[PDB]
RNA sequence: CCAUAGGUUAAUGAGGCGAACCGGGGGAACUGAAACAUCUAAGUACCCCGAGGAAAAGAAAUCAACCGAGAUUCCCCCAG
RNA sequence: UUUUGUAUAAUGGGUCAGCGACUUAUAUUCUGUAGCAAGGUUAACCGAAUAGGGGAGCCGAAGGGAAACCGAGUCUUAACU
RNA sequence: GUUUAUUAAAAACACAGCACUGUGCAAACACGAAAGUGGACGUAUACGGUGUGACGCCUGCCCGGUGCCGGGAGGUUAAU
RNA sequence: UGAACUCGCUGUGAAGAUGCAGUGUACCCGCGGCAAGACGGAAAGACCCCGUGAACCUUUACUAUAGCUUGACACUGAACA
RNA sequence: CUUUAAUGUUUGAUGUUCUAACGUUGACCCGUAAUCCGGGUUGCGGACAGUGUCUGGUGGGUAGUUUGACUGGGGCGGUCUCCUCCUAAAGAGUAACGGAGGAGCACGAAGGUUGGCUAAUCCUGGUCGGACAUCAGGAGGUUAGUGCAAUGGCAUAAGCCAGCUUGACUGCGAGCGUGACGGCGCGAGCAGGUGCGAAAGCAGGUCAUAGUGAUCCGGUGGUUCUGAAUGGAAGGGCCAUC
């Protein structure tokens, strides 16, 4: 054969999701570009990761303009 | 060469006298350990005064407290 | 006659209080410049042997 | 391989270093930045030296 | 040239054998290292020389740690 | 017996009788059980003696640190919420 | 002529003859820790090694590569 | 040579059945012949693969090494140019 | 200092002669009835040769060994680590000698931050100048660009532009993800010290995802650590690094 390669999986995906409570710096979705944006009490890390900034729920809401989905935390 | 000497088995030496050879009489501390040390292990009723010897900040608290004098 | 331990393996580890084990992390030897600060600060102070490979470790050295 | 290896050694100071890598051939002059002695525990000019 | 080597005779022991143990002279490989060459097995098996009732070792140019042990050997610890 | 799978036309056995395979020693960790308990416990030896001495030791009651060192703290670190 | 005793007797081995090659005699070379033997009580018309294989006609070009032989200036070069 | 009260066929089935299913046929037992089957007997396949198995053999595979070969020091001394 | 002459002073490659070591499988003599061996005369070599220790070269003569796995039997061929997409059945994961591509880096500006900006490709007009270089307006709007594959992502621009700079900073790190483990990754906030901004702030490299190898051994710098009687040292340790 002239293929037969493939790379190691990343893990890649929402690692918590709506509704669930999250601890301060838990991470919500690892992913490769913002498909999902940071909003209320959320970062984003280098590697684009969204992440907990406060102990709440996770909440995701579809808001915009161009119409984006973004996570939030709620207390 | 060096040993830990609970404090808890310091009042079985000599009334309340316990250098080196005397506290090596007393089956505390192996032969061969020149340097030791008296650590917070609890319980001290005889004055005993420590000579010759290391002693912890807690253990000269105690040690006081009960009666004997340090070095 | 008595066991021998695995010297290689008690120069590599060392008994805690409880029963667990404190080694030293990997990568922290040679090729530092390539690797980032992060890493070389949270490889540098010892680490306790996973509940996997601990009976491993227990076997080699049943002396401490 | 042709990208080699540097040390950045501070100035004033103990002789505490950084390392990073160059291209000699491109730039053949000597790199003066001013990066942070922990031991001084203050900003110094590090100045470039082989290794 | 003297002499020496020699060659006789005579005293005086030696010669060979024997289970293990002892000291010396030589001295493997399988094996283990999951291969293998350093290393291991191991100065082990074995071969050879001298023994003796035992043999070897032995009265410090020892080793301690500012105190001190006072020859060798063998056993238990120190310590896997 | 070995196998995904054997009436298998895969292995082994002509039959009977006898023999024939997880042992032994010392170290070690764990479970049960008995002693005594912050203690437990002796080794060679000395006993003619399975008594009794002999605690030299070992293990436990304290750990942190690479180590000096400090010690209910200590390590890290210039200092740690 | 010899050969796989016990599945191969041959075109295989040997052979007389042929070439290259080493060997000057305490020979080369071989057996041997060595002494020493064989070579040989021989001495280059001799001896050992290699290939080829009676006899007739012949045996062409290549010395870049590997080996061998000679050369000693230069480079590099161990012990000391 | 496991034991046998040891038939044919078609199918099934570790995939080519004396032994299973369905079926067909066949009194009990010798003796001489034949050799299609009992995947007949004879040798833990010699082919192939596998084992970090073995042995010999080859070489500009790695490591050594006898032998051969080069120098230093040793046994090893006096002149002069 | 250069450049060189005469004498003292200190050694060496060469050789050539010598005899006394050494050799003698030259000759004779004696132990002696003996081609052995020794001893003794005597010639011929003669400090060479030979032999010991050390040393370079050579060395299948001889010895011990090694000579990978996957594999639709083994060989030959191909592959072996890392990244991207599909296969992968709407969380993660998921094989095959299944289907397609990339990586073993690059950059003191391509990082930081502040302040700006907007693209492709056409249309028409215009000197040389033409389809296309540069200009003007109009059209389209992200087909663009992103240091490199592919994926996901970006106008608040992560795009392209400038001005200062060095956060590609040391000590940490609440709490998570991902791994059998080794490990790997994301990270608000704290202490210290910078940069940029008028400040809110942002900054622990680069839009993210490949650019990489454990241990041992040894080297290089640092160091309130250890130091075999004591003082040092060597040597270890710890930190940085190759
Ligand atoms: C050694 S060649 C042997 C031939 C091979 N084996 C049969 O049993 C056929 O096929
Ligand atoms: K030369
Ligand atoms: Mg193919
Ligand atoms: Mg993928
Ligand atoms: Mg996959
Ligand atoms: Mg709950
Ligand atoms: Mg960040
Ligand atoms: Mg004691
Ligand atoms: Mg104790
Ligand atoms: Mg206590
Ligand atoms: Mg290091
Ligand atoms: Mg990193
Ligand atoms: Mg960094
Ligand atoms: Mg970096
Ligand atoms: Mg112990
Ligand atoms: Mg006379
Ligand atoms: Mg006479
Ligand atoms: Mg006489
Ligand atoms: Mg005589
Ligand atoms: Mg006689
Ligand atoms: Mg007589
Ligand atoms: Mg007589
Ligand atoms: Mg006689
Ligand atoms: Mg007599
Ligand atoms: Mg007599
Ligand atoms: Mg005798
Ligand atoms: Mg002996
Ligand atoms: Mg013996
Ligand atoms: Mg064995
Ligand atoms: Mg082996
Ligand atoms: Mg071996
Ligand atoms: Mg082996
Ligand atoms: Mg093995
Ligand atoms: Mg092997
Ligand atoms: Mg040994
Ligand atoms: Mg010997
Ligand atoms: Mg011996
Ligand atoms: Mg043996
Ligand atoms: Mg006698
Ligand atoms: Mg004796
Ligand atoms: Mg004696
Ligand atoms: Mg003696
Ligand atoms: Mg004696
Ligand atoms: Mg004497
Ligand atoms: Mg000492
Ligand atoms: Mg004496
Ligand atoms: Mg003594
Ligand atoms: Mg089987
Ligand atoms: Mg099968
Ligand atoms: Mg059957
Ligand atoms: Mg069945
Ligand atoms: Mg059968
Ligand atoms: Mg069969
Ligand atoms: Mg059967
Ligand atoms: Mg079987
Ligand atoms: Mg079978
Ligand atoms: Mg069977
Ligand atoms: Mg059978
Ligand atoms: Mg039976
Ligand atoms: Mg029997
Ligand atoms: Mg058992
Ligand atoms: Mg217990
Ligand atoms: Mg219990
Ligand atoms: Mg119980
Ligand atoms: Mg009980
Ligand atoms: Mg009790
Ligand atoms: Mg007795
Ligand atoms: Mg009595
Ligand atoms: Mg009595
Ligand atoms: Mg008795
Ligand atoms: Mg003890
Ligand atoms: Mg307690
Ligand atoms: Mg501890
Ligand atoms: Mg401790
Ligand atoms: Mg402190
Ligand atoms: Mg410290
Ligand atoms: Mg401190
Ligand atoms: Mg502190
Ligand atoms: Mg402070
Ligand atoms: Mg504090
Ligand atoms: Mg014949
Ligand atoms: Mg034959
Ligand atoms: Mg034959
Ligand atoms: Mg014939
Ligand atoms: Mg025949
Ligand atoms: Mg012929
Ligand atoms: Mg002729
Ligand atoms: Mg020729
Ligand atoms: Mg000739
Ligand atoms: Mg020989
Ligand atoms: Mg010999
Ligand atoms: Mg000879
Ligand atoms: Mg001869
Ligand atoms: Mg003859
Ligand atoms: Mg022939
Ligand atoms: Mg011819
Ligand atoms: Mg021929
Ligand atoms: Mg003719
Ligand atoms: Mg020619
Ligand atoms: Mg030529
Ligand atoms: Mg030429
Ligand atoms: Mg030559
Ligand atoms: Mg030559
Ligand atoms: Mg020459
Ligand atoms: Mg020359
Ligand atoms: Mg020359
Ligand atoms: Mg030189
Ligand atoms: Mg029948
Ligand atoms: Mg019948
Ligand atoms: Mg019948
Ligand atoms: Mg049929
Ligand atoms: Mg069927
Ligand atoms: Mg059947
Ligand atoms: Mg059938
Ligand atoms: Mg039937
Ligand atoms: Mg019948
Ligand atoms: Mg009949
Ligand atoms: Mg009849
Ligand atoms: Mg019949
Ligand atoms: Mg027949
Ligand atoms: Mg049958
Ligand atoms: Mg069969
Ligand atoms: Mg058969
Ligand atoms: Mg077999
Ligand atoms: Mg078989
Ligand atoms: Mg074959
Ligand atoms: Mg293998
Ligand atoms: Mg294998
Ligand atoms: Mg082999
Ligand atoms: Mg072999
Ligand atoms: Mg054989
Ligand atoms: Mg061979
Ligand atoms: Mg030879
Ligand atoms: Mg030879
Ligand atoms: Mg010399
Ligand atoms: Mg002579
Ligand atoms: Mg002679
Ligand atoms: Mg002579
Ligand atoms: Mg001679
Ligand atoms: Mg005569
Ligand atoms: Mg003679
Ligand atoms: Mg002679
Ligand atoms: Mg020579
Ligand atoms: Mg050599
Ligand atoms: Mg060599
Ligand atoms: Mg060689
Ligand atoms: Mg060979
Ligand atoms: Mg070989
Ligand atoms: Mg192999
Ligand atoms: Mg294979
Ligand atoms: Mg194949
Ligand atoms: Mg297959
Ligand atoms: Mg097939
Ligand atoms: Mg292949
Ligand atoms: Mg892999
Ligand atoms: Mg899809
Ligand atoms: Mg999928
Ligand atoms: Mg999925
Ligand atoms: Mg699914
Ligand atoms: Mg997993
Ligand atoms: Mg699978
Ligand atoms: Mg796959
Ligand atoms: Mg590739
Ligand atoms: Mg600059
Ligand atoms: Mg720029
Ligand atoms: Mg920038
Ligand atoms: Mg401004
Ligand atoms: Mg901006
Ligand atoms: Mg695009
Ligand atoms: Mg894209
Ligand atoms: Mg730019
Ligand atoms: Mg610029
Ligand atoms: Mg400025
Ligand atoms: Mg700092
Ligand atoms: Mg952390
Ligand atoms: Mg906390
Ligand atoms: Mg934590
Ligand atoms: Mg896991
Ligand atoms: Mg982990
Ligand atoms: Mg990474
Ligand atoms: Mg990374
Ligand atoms: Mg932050
Ligand atoms: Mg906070
Ligand atoms: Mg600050
Ligand atoms: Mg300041
Ligand atoms: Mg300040
Ligand atoms: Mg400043
Ligand atoms: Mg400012
Ligand atoms: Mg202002
Ligand atoms: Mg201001
Ligand atoms: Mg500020
Ligand atoms: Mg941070
Ligand atoms: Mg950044
Ligand atoms: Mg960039
Ligand atoms: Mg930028
Ligand atoms: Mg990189
Ligand atoms: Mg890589
Ligand atoms: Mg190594
Ligand atoms: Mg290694
Ligand atoms: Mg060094
Ligand atoms: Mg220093
Ligand atoms: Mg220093
Ligand atoms: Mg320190
Ligand atoms: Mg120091
Ligand atoms: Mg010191
Ligand atoms: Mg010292
Ligand atoms: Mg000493
Ligand atoms: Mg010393
Ligand atoms: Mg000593
Ligand atoms: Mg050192
Ligand atoms: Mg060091
Ligand atoms: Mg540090
Ligand atoms: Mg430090």
Same mark, same amino acid.
């Given at each position: 054969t002239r293929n037969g390669r493939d790379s190691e999986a990343k893990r890649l995906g929402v690692k918590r999701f709506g509704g669930e409570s999250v601890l301060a710096g838990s991470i919500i979705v690892r992913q490769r570009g913002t498909k999902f944006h940071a909003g209320a009490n959320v970062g984003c890390g280098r590697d684009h990761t969204l992440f907990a900034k +406060? $102990?709440?729920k996770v909440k995701f809401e579809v808001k915009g303009p161009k119409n984006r989905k973004f996570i939030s935390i709620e207390a | 060469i060096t040993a830990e000497i609970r404090?808890? $088995?310091l009042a079985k030496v000599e009334g309340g006298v316990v250098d080196l050879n005397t506290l090596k009489a007393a089956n505390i501390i192996g032969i061969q350990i020149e340097f030791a040390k008296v650590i917070l292990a609890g319980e001290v009723t005889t004055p005993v005064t420590v000579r010759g010897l290391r002693v912890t900040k807690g253990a000269r608290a105690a040690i006081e407290a009960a009666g004997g004098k340090i070095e | 006659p008595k066991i021998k331990t695995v010297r290689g393996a008690a120069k590599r580890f060392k008994k805690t209080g409880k029963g667990g084990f404190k080694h030293? !992390? +990997?990568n922290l030897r040679h090729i530092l410049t390539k690797k980032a600060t992060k890493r070389k600060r949270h490889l540098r102070p010892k680490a306790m042997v996973s509940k996997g490979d601990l009976g491993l470790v227990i076997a080699c050295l049943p002396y401490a | 391989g042709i990208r080699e290896k540097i040390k950045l050694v501070s100035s004033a100071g103990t002789g505490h270093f950084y390392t990073t890598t160059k291209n000699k051939r491109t730039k053949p002059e000597k790199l003066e930045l001013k990066k942070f002695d922990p #031991? #001084?525990?203050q !900003?110094?000019?590090?100045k470039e030296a082989k290794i």
């Open positions: +406060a $102990d709440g | 404090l808890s $088995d | 030293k !992390h +990997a | #031991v #001084v525990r !900003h110094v000019i590090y």
